[PDB]
Amino acid sequence: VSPALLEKAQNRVIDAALTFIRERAKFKGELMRSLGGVAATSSLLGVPLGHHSSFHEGSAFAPPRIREAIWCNSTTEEGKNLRDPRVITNVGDVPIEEIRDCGVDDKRLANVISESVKLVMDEDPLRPLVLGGDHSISFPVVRAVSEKLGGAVDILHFDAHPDLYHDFEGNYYSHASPFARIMEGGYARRLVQVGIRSITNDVREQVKKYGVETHEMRTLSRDRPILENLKLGEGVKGVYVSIDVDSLDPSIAPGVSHHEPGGLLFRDILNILQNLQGDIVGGDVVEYNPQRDTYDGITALVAAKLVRELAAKMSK
Amino acid sequence: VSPALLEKAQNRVIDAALTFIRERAKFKGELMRSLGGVAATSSLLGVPLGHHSSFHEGSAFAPPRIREAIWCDSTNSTTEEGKNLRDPRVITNVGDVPIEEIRDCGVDDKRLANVISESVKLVMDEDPLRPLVLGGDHSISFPVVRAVSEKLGGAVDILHFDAHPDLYHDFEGNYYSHASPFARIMEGGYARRLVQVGIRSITNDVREQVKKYGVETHEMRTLSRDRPILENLKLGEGVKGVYVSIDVDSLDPSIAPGVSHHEPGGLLFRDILNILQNLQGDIVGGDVVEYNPQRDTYDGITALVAAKLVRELAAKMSK
Amino acid sequence: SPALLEKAQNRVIDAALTFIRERAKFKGELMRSLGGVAATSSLLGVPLGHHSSFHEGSAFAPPRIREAIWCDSTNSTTEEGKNLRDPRVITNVGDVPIEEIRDCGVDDKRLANVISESVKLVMDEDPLRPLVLGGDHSISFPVVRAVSEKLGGAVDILHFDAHPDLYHDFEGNYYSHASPFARIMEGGYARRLVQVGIRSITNDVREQVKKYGVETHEMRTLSRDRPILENLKLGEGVKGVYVSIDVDSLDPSIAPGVSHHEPGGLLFRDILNILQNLQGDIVGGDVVEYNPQRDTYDGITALVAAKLVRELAAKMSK
Amino acid sequence: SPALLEKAQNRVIDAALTFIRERAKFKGELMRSLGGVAATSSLLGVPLGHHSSFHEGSAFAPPRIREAIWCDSTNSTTEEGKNLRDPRVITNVGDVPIEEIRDCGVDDKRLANVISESVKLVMDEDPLRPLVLGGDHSISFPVVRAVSEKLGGAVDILHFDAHPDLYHDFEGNYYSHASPFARIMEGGYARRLVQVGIRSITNDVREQVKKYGVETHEMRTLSRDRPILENLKLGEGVKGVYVSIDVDSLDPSIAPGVSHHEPGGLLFRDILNILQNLQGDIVGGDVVEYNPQRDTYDGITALVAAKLVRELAAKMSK
Amino acid sequence: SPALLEKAQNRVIDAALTFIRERAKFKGELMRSLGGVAATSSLLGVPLGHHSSFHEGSAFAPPRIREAIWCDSTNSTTEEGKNLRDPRVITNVGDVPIEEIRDCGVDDKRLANVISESVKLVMDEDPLRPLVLGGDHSISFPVVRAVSEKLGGAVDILHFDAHPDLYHDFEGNYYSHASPFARIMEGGYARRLVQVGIRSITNDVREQVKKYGVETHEMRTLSRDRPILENLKLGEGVKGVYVSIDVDSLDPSIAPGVSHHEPGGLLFRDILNILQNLQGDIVGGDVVEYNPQRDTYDGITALVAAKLVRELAAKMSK
Amino acid sequence: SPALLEKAQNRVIDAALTFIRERAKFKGELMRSLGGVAATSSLLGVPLGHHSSFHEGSAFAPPRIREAIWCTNSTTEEGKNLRDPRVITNVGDVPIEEIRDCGVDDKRLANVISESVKLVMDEDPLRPLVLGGDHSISFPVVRAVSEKLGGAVDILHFDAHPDLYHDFEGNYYSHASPFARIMEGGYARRLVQVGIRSITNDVREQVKKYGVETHEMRTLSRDRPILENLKLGEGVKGVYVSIDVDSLDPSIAPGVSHHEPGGLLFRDILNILQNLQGDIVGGDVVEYNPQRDTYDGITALVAAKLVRELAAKMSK
Ligand SMILES: [Mn+2]
Ligand SMILES: [Mn+2]
Ligand SMILES: [Mn+2]
Ligand SMILES: [Mn+2]
Ligand SMILES: [Mn+2]
Ligand SMILES: [Mn+2]
Ligand SMILES: [Mn+2]
Ligand SMILES: [Mn+2]
Ligand SMILES: [Mn+2]
Ligand SMILES: [Mn+2]
Ligand SMILES: [Mn+2]
Ligand SMILES: [Mn+2]
């Protein structure tokens, strides 16, 4: 296999993929500006990546399924208008499969994701709402938001799992290590984790090493008043919200790779998200696995709901 | 069929069965006794018996499905409160009593129950092992709790999670029904306190049974008032210790679809963990019953639910 | 032909109402022969779905609910100790043959009148009280109209639902399943309307709520409203209390068998807490919007609808 | 009370048969008013399941089948070009209210009489011919009895089933879904009985095949018998042809919605090849043993049952 | 604002087409560097479902089909022994980003032209030949138009489908999935059109068949047609052979993951028998109408579509 | 100490083989006391799935298959009465999980399987009918049948896959390699494969190397008369029948690890098995995966019908 064939294929396909995201972001930025009366518009960038998953890769197919459940009332829990393009709009998906088929390695793939995020952010007034994909994508996304904005953000992170593994199966880019990568890089100050019910003792050392505010399910009843009155981002560049759908009890969100019984109810996430104070600069909804959902696609609907509510907080 | 030949088949096959259990318990006992730093080890004994169920016998297939889910690729090996399931001193498998092959020798249910009791005693004799039984339908708790009580030399207190009191005196003339284990236990005085949680399915004649044996039945319709007591139970003070029986049908069927008796309006997963995490007392044994893999979803969610109940019970009983 | 239709319609409708009359009469006579009974919860199916905005499969619910009430996994005792094998606690009348009547070219206004008369035929047989199995939510309007007219005045309503069903005009359909409570409040048939489980509501509807003085409880305030909802006292000073249970009220994890899934709904124990604690003279009720064609393979939603019906019967029967 | 049941039974049954008469009379008038028609396939549901040995959920089948016929993923043209939107091609009468008659304490013998009379009320309305929707297979006996009595002689029967249903005595139940064709042959209602799809017959029952001259085609011989089965000519020199289709005759891969799964059954195209080719005067027929409680989430067995009803109607209507 | 759309639309389309060109140029140069190849089966996804009449879930199919092709329960050898691990046997180009282009307000004619141009970019890279993954059957018209224009003449088409897809006018959508072959035969892009598995056809569309000389083979004549169908020779006298495989051609017991369930369809082996024996120069093909949203939990239909692609590629690659 | 492990191994395997011995000793005495029999098909489960390449759920098949056997009627297609113990009888399951959990390696495990089959055969008139379990178990079974009978057998083998890989990912004991192990050891003379439709070019060389009669689905119509008239065993010790449930089309046997579209119908196998001539000394039904079956357990019923037909051919 010729080396300079793969290497210029890698260059050429990445460039054509990023140029598509650019023209799409440029189109939507221009649109929001012509309508006016908007400081921020939540912009959907899909990252259909599932190969960093330790169990099932079905995540890769989530973004299109979520956008179908978004755009199929048209009104969010607090009355923003979904058909208003100023509240929510689509940019596109990074064509992960086609980029990987060029032999691109994971480090460059992470860079492609980061560059995609910065293409969106460059077009005022778009702000990135990333659809996963597995949780490994949060690292490149948060990295991109921190670099573009010129400092750290605070994070609200819903998950069953801390995703703070220093070393997961020798895979630096594991969906079980993105917050390790994020904290190792200084991209976040505060990391507020909610839903946690699967945590190793080594990862409790990581929690201590980085000053993570890890809230476990076994103390949720004690924690509710705190969690329902979070205020983040004061004195840093803003607030980033990461929602891992496996944060929700498997009874209400079966469409995930990692079933962990004893999780959040839908209301738990909506109360916390709605009550959250701070300037939201970006967010993700990750680990929706359509291949593990029920036939009625209850988990696509839940995932779409969470995206709608994130967009209503982040659009202004 | 000569009765002679059948009787000798029975003795010999049972002997062979109990010797198998003896040798697995001997292995796991020596292992723990050579690791040291261990007062108790939760030790899985399967009793794959469904024939006492009133509606569906699928829980006979449960134990191997539960072990696989305990040891499942999507889960780490740490319990909610920090115990490492990779440490054998936290949890170990002994194995399954071969119910089907024994019944197939024409053994009657009284002798079958005796064989389940001997199995429990063979685990208990290998200190620091403590029996965490995997059912199987709920009928098995009678012979398990009889065996615990007889080996400890006295009464235990029981914390029992169920939709159903399982206190019938007489269910379809089957003494060993999955709906009378606790009538057998209470009749035998094998238990002092019996604290029942998740109850939402009870006939007026079993309400008699509750009053007659001074059973502490907590019904779902009084739960929110009961939370403060249930989150601070202290059992076993002045008897030989505490036995914890978890019927998976205690949980709402939205959580635990893989059961024979769907009863809407049940516990959430976290309600069992709150009670269990808060429970005080020397836990001497326990069981997880009525997982039915034939009624589970395609993803095996209830196997995972049962496996997590086993993991958190082991985390409490291991020491 | 003009006449054929007019003719057919009347004759087919009269034979259908006659079948209900005979069944009600049979069950009334039995109860009065047994004695020691003031009220018997009496099942009347209205298998109607064509008023649904997404799926019409709730037309199949009634017989599936009835089967699940008397099914092999459960016992015949309700949570608080009533015995369902006593016909004075619960009894079946039968199903209005909606399909057959529609298929005669009968419009929705006439159909509403047939549903109304069928309910009166059950109420004409003391001590029966109507427990209607839907069918979609549109049925509650003609049912509540009948109960009101029959008792000679207003009822207070406890309504479980994901949706307010208070639209003035859901897409030009007066008998929409999203408008039955608009028609009830317009008609004067209800004084209080207590709605529990709401999580889907537009701004135009919030104004319908203020306009009729409706007590709309949304999911986002559920945890705070618990003490109110676990202490309802309805119907004092009017003809009594009607309980309408839209199965969609419940989280789809508990009740997947419905046409509109709405995440973040009631737990089954949330409905039972409210319903078991409700004080007031329950004069009738309905369990609507169970859709067997969206249920799971084990038919859990059938079992959920049956338990709602069993627990509502425990309260209305006396 | 003795009188209480006897009187109710009679009045309830009379009101049920009156409803079926009015619906039959309405559709006969409709057809005669249109003209250009010798025969119209007329659906009579018989929602009975309790004559089953494993599951009773075939009681839910008729409305489900009707919905699947007049549905949305398909078109309305049969495979050889007949339009189902023409009422002269197919029409619904309605459902015998079996649950409600049985709930009056009516025994199976009188129940069979009710079914028989119901079929006869359809046959009294030129040009309607009965296409019965089960229900479990027990219903074929009262149906074929009625057709035989009404026409005044024997029919030939084409029967698709995984089981012969020629048990004299299945678990003491005279009206067993396992005994309908032993009752038909005993009574001389049928001359030929051509059974197709058989793959589950005990030797005792093999005796019964020879005892009554039954033409039983087993699955192991199907590929050899194809030529005969695709060239059937029935009814010559008697009153006509009755076609009974048990859905379990199909492979469970195609028809999972049945009570008794039997691997190695017919392909759907196996039934169409026989049915589209059959020569003879089709005078009635049935599609039984669809069980919606065992169907898949997409309700494919309901579609399978509907396409059988559609293709049988294509052949019976003229 | 108008200039905004004109501007953006052309620039978003240009960037999409650029993407496909670079993938096709990479894949073409790879085969040319390996040598020993005359034709490489090259996957182009068209994830378009909005021309669907019942369900649009075939929009999600291409990436599910590719995962199944390269799945870890299957090995990489076709039935007749071609190694799919060899890029010269099967390669991926990519998906036309339909959603994203449609969300710039691009109309259906302009979309068809983007699909055609995409096909043309693959065909420009010797020795790539286009194997299109739908998406719904609408996509065959702009694919086959592109093929024909590119080659400068007609093709013969082998079409597998339950449905002729020959409507002139399906609900006023020119681009309906029920009309692609009307659009094809009307534009003279095809000479012979051989259809196999047909079992859903209206009398009007029967007209269309005679009108265009379509060689429609219906399921009800299959065994009579087998020796013809197992010895097809197409393309002789024109530019080559296009094969269109609609997944609903298979019986729903085998391919449940489709929008239109039509009972009594082809067995998997029947498509392979025909395709394994087909003579002529295959210049393109598509596998259409796999609907992941209607598949079973184990994704069986994805594997069914994947194997169809693998066996078409084995035949198209030389 | 490693002495602790070796001891556990020796003593646990010894107890497990004594269990199978007492069960086989029981059923032998039962048939001999009953008389009128020369062969009784005796069920031995080998609940093993770790040699699987995709899913291990065939480990749970044996109990599920026995339950579907005695759940339908009670007469074999050719009128054998399955309530007659001389027609079919259960010995028991080899406790695979409990022997592996003592640290026993694959070679010693193959030996335990071989010894269990010999314990069955030592009891006249029992013949072993083995329930899998994945296809890897056919190697130790056929080796045991060949050693106890003192020579080779002919094999009829239904499968979608040849199972003739010399080296499957370094796993000598792969379920994709048992017939390579069997031919290498010379335990079989003829090997007639039916249902084959997944076959690599290196495995065609294995077919050539051992003179395997490999019938592919793409020649089934030409092969029918031949396959419906097989005569095996003349000149050798007899006939072994191996049934892999994935030989059947996935439409009728969805409960397997390896879906291969375009397989056999149920009659295809039944016509072949019923018409087969030769002295049947042994057989297996394998690769039933209960975890991938439909909610109704259709594949358990299929597998039970396959067992009943094989038990009717072998019992006499
Ligand atoms: Mn995560
Ligand atoms: Mn997670
Ligand atoms: Mn219990
Ligand atoms: Mn229970
Ligand atoms: Mn409603
Ligand atoms: Mn509603
Ligand atoms: Mn039958
Ligand atoms: Mn049958
Ligand atoms: Mn098509
Ligand atoms: Mn089609
Ligand atoms: Mn194999
Ligand atoms: Mn295989």
Numbering used by the authors:
A (entry chain A): 20 to 91, 95 to 338
B (entry chain B): 20 to 338
C (entry chain C), D (entry chain F), E (entry chain D): 21 to 338
F (entry chain E): 21 to 91, 94 to 338
In the authors' words:
In this route, ornithine is obtained from arginine by the action of arginase (arginine amidinohydrolase, ARGAH). Similarly to other eukaryotic (Di Costanzo et al., 2010) and prokaryotic (Bewley et al., 1999) orthologues, plant ARGAHs, are binuclear manganese metalloenzymes. Together with agmatinase, formiminoglutamase, and proclavaminate aminohydrolase, ARGAHs are grouped with the Ureohydrolase Superfamily.
In this work, ARGAHs from two model plant species, A. thaliana (AtARGAH1) and Medicago truncatula (MtARGAH), are structurally characterized by X-ray crystallography and small-angle X-ray scattering (SAXS).
